[PDB]
Scaffold this motif. Structure first.
Motif, PDB file in Angstrom:
ATOM      1  N   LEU A   1      23.296  87.658  54.989  1.00 32.88           N
ATOM      2  CA  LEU A   1      23.426  86.216  55.146  1.00 32.88           C
ATOM      3  C   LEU A   1      24.012  85.593  53.887  1.00 32.88           C
ATOM      4  O   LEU A   1      24.311  84.398  53.847  1.00 32.88           O
ATOM      5  CB  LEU A   1      22.069  85.595  55.471  1.00 32.88           C
ATOM      6  CG  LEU A   1      21.492  86.049  56.819  1.00 32.88           C
ATOM      7  CD1 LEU A   1      20.008  85.721  56.923  1.00 32.88           C
ATOM      8  CD2 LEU A   1      22.279  85.430  57.979  1.00 32.88           C
ATOM      9  N   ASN A   2      24.176  86.413  52.857  1.00 31.07           N
ATOM     10  CA  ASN A   2      24.706  85.936  51.592  1.00 31.07           C
ATOM     11  C   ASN A   2      26.186  86.258  51.445  1.00 31.07           C
ATOM     12  O   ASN A   2      26.661  86.533  50.343  1.00 31.07           O
ATOM     13  CB  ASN A   2      23.923  86.530  50.426  1.00 31.07           C
ATOM     14  CG  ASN A   2      23.911  85.621  49.214  1.00 31.07           C
ATOM     15  OD1 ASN A   2      22.849  85.286  48.686  1.00 31.07           O
ATOM     16  ND2 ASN A   2      25.094  85.209  48.771  1.00 31.07           N
TER      17      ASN A   2
ATOM     18  N   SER B   1      28.534  83.957  52.831  1.00 30.28           N
ATOM     19  CA  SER B   1      28.714  82.511  52.566  1.00 30.28           C
ATOM     20  C   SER B   1      29.803  81.846  53.425  1.00 30.28           C
ATOM     21  O   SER B   1      29.468  81.028  54.287  1.00 30.28           O
ATOM     22  CB  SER B   1      28.979  82.211  51.081  1.00 30.28           C
ATOM     23  OG  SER B   1      27.870  82.572  50.277  1.00 30.28           O
TER      24      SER B   1
ATOM     25  N   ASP C   1      31.130  81.070  56.106  1.00 30.46           N
ATOM     26  CA  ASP C   1      30.988  81.279  57.538  1.00 30.46           C
ATOM     27  C   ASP C   1      30.945  82.774  57.852  1.00 30.46           C
ATOM     28  O   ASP C   1      31.699  83.262  58.691  1.00 30.46           O
ATOM     29  CB  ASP C   1      32.130  80.590  58.291  1.00 30.46           C
TER      30      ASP C   1
ATOM     31  N   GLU D   1      25.677  85.405  59.567  1.00 29.00           N
ATOM     32  CA  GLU D   1      25.270  84.018  59.721  1.00 29.00           C
ATOM     33  C   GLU D   1      25.763  83.433  61.047  1.00 29.00           C
ATOM     34  O   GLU D   1      25.044  82.684  61.700  1.00 29.00           O
ATOM     35  CB  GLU D   1      25.786  83.177  58.549  1.00 29.00           C
ATOM     36  CG  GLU D   1      25.099  81.830  58.395  1.00 29.00           C
ATOM     37  CD  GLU D   1      25.171  81.306  56.970  1.00 29.00           C
ATOM     38  OE1 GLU D   1      24.163  81.426  56.238  1.00 29.00           O
ATOM     39  OE2 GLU D   1      26.237  80.783  56.581  1.00 29.00           O
TER      40      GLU D   1
ATOM     41  N   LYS E   1      23.296  82.022  64.161  1.00 25.77           N
ATOM     42  CA  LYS E   1      23.302  80.635  64.614  1.00 25.77           C
ATOM     43  C   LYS E   1      23.858  80.542  66.038  1.00 25.77           C
ATOM     44  O   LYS E   1      23.527  79.614  66.766  1.00 25.77           O
ATOM     45  CB  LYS E   1      24.066  79.716  63.654  1.00 25.77           C
ATOM     46  CG  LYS E   1      25.443  80.151  63.235  1.00 25.77           C
ATOM     47  CD  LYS E   1      25.932  79.241  62.103  1.00 25.77           C
ATOM     48  CE  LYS E   1      24.850  79.067  61.035  1.00 25.77           C
ATOM     49  NZ  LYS E   1      25.084  77.883  60.160  1.00 25.77           N
TER      50      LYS E   1
ATOM     51  N   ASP F   1      18.147  78.843  62.908  1.00 22.45           N
ATOM     52  CA  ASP F   1      18.374  78.050  61.706  1.00 22.45           C
ATOM     53  C   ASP F   1      18.462  79.013  60.518  1.00 22.45           C
ATOM     54  O   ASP F   1      17.441  79.376  59.935  1.00 22.45           O
ATOM     55  CB  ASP F   1      17.242  77.027  61.526  1.00 22.45           C
ATOM     56  CG  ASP F   1      17.456  76.086  60.343  1.00 22.45           C
ATOM     57  OD1 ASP F   1      18.198  76.431  59.394  1.00 22.45           O
ATOM     58  OD2 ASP F   1      16.851  74.990  60.362  1.00 22.45           O
ATOM     59  N   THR F   2      19.679  79.421  60.167  1.00 22.75           N
ATOM     60  CA  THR F   2      19.883  80.439  59.136  1.00 22.75           C
ATOM     61  C   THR F   2      19.568  79.938  57.725  1.00 22.75           C
ATOM     62  O   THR F   2      19.331  80.737  56.821  1.00 22.75           O
ATOM     63  CB  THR F   2      21.326  80.972  59.157  1.00 22.75           C
ATOM     64  OG1 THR F   2      22.235  79.868  59.119  1.00 22.75           O
ATOM     65  CG2 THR F   2      21.578  81.782  60.422  1.00 22.75           C
ATOM     66  N   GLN F   3      19.571  78.622  57.538  1.00 20.84           N
ATOM     67  CA  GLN F   3      19.152  78.034  56.268  1.00 20.84           C
ATOM     68  C   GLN F   3      17.646  78.213  56.114  1.00 20.84           C
ATOM     69  O   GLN F   3      17.146  78.519  55.028  1.00 20.84           O
ATOM     70  CB  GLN F   3      19.530  76.549  56.192  1.00 20.84           C
ATOM     71  N   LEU F   4      16.931  78.028  57.221  1.00 23.86           N
ATOM     72  CA  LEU F   4      15.491  78.219  57.251  1.00 23.86           C
ATOM     73  C   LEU F   4      15.159  79.680  56.993  1.00 23.86           C
ATOM     74  O   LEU F   4      14.299  79.995  56.166  1.00 23.86           O
ATOM     75  CB  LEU F   4      14.917  77.786  58.599  1.00 23.86           C
ATOM     76  CG  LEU F   4      13.487  77.243  58.678  1.00 23.86           C
ATOM     77  CD1 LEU F   4      12.789  77.805  59.900  1.00 23.86           C
ATOM     78  CD2 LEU F   4      12.674  77.502  57.424  1.00 23.86           C
TER      79      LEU F   4
ATOM     80  N   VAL G   1      16.801  82.091  55.479  1.00 20.47           N
ATOM     81  CA  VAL G   1      16.994  82.430  54.068  1.00 20.47           C
ATOM     82  C   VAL G   1      15.847  81.930  53.184  1.00 20.47           C
ATOM     83  O   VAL G   1      15.314  82.677  52.352  1.00 20.47           O
ATOM     84  CB  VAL G   1      18.328  81.862  53.535  1.00 20.47           C
ATOM     85  CG1 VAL G   1      18.361  81.884  52.017  1.00 20.47           C
ATOM     86  CG2 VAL G   1      19.502  82.641  54.107  1.00 20.47           C
ATOM     87  N   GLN G   2      15.460  80.672  53.373  1.00 15.96           N
ATOM     88  CA  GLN G   2      14.390  80.085  52.575  1.00 15.96           C
ATOM     89  C   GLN G   2      13.086  80.858  52.776  1.00 15.96           C
ATOM     90  O   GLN G   2      12.342  81.095  51.825  1.00 15.96           O
ATOM     91  CB  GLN G   2      14.200  78.603  52.928  1.00 15.96           C
TER      92      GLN G   2
END
Length: 376
Positions: free
Chosen positions: A36-37, A39, A41, A45, A49, A54-57, A59-60
């Motif tokens: 996922l890193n 970046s 697009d 990732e 999606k 929610d790929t931001q979620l 990762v966090q």
């Protein structure tokens, strides 16, 4: 090192990620983090999606999870120790590669294996947000059949066109705004000459003023170079020779800026006749329909197209504009190099009754065709 280029780069990142979290072991969810890193697009990732994640979620929460893991002293060796799950992930990715009949193990194979085998983190996390292996596998096969960039065109996309031209020393600018709907192969644009009166007929600029909005049918989605180069975009260069008259040379970049697809162009025209069909404004305000033949330019990693535009002249004759076109991707990412095919184009020109500036309202419809293989 018999993975895809992108896949082995993710694998090569593991030690570093392990060192970041002060980990003795490297595990499946670290590989996920690495995937996922990418970046810009990135494939992993995009797949997720497309699955509703929610790929931001994600990762966090990978970061959170990793920071809570039990501390272990690292080994003396530079290479981190492979965890049990990651070991199973790598083994099963060899199975998956063979089941796709692929050359090397790629991001798709690794991602599917992680989802399949990581019962510790990834699988239960997706279950929480109601996503399973088969939902992701279908997302992978969907992207396999086209490109990641195609996903950028599934709805209505705002369009900006900016052109600076110089024809026989007459300098002008044109700005276009509107939207594109590649699902229906449709675009709608209004262009204005921002500098004053256009010194050439509007129809001579139609081809110069975004073939990424063509509708490629399902059986042809492996042949859509234009979308595959997005969001980074492509360079589009042309020579346009008007028979018995002058010549345009154009250079443009077509690319996303934010959520807008932008076509930014420089045009130079020379050797035009001052009372010919172009500088003398003798062309009808319309635009005929054309079939444009597209071929892969293997050495330049792009496409090419030569085609003949026919402009109706007010004296009943036809003015030919012979086009020579070459496109090359701006990015370094993989693009689709197509089998030979054609784009069927149809265009309607009109005027905006509320507009007092020199302008063109354009509506086009473009569909790809020419590939008729054994049904699959």
């Amino acid at each position: 090192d018999d993975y895809t280029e992108k896949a082995w780069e993710a694998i090569s990142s593991l030690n570093k990620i392990g060192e970041k979290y002060d980990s003795a072991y490297v595990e499946a969810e670290m590989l996920l983090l690495a995937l996922l890193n990418d970046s810009p697009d990135g494939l992993a990732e995009r797949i997720l999606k497309e699955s509703g994640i929610d790929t931001q979620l994600l990762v966090q929460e990978i970061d959170d999870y990793l920071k809570k893991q039990p501390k272990m002293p690292s080994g003396f060796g530079e290479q981190k120790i492979l965890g049990r799950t990651l070991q199973t992930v790598l083994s099963t990715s060899k199975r998956l590669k063979k089941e796709f009949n692929d050359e090397y193990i790629s991001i798709e194979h690794l991602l599917l294996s992680i989802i399949s085998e990581d019962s510790k983190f990834t699988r239960p996390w997706l279950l929480k947000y109601n996503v399973n292996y088969e939902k992701v596998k279908k997302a992978v096969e969907k992207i396999r059949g086209g490109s990641k960039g195609e996903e950028l065109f599934t709805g209505v996309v705002p369009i900006l066109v900016e052109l600076d031209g110089d024809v026989n020393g007459h300098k002008f600018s044109v700005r276009g705004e509107g939207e594109g709907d590649a699902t229906n192969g449709k675009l709608t644009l209004k262009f204005i000459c921002t500098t004053g009166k256009l010194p050439v007929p509007w129809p001579t600029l139609v081809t110069t003023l975004v073939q990424c909005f063509s509708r490629y049918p399902d059986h042809m989605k492996r042949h859509d170079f234009f979308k595959s180069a997005m969001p980074e975009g492509y360079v589009q260069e042309r020579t346009i020779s008007f028979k018995d008259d002058g010549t345009y040379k154009t250079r443009a970049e077509v690319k996303f800026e934010g959520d807008t697809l932008v076509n930014r162009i420089e045009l130079k025209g020379i050797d035009f006749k001052e009372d010919g069909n172009i500088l003398g404004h003798k062309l009808e305000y319309n635009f005929n329909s054309h079939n444009v033949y597209i071929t892969a330019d293997k050495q330049k990693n792009g496409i090419k197209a030569n085609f003949k535009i026919r402009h109706n002249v007010e004296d009943g004759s036809v003015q030919l504009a012979d086009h020579y076109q070459q496109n090359t991707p701006i990015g370094d990412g993989p693009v689709l190099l197509p089998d030979n095919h054609y784009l069927s184009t149809q265009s309607v020109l009109s005027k905006d009754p509320n507009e007092k500036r020199d302008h063109m309202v354009l509506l086009e419809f473009v569909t790809a065709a020419g590939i008729t293989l054994v049904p699959r």
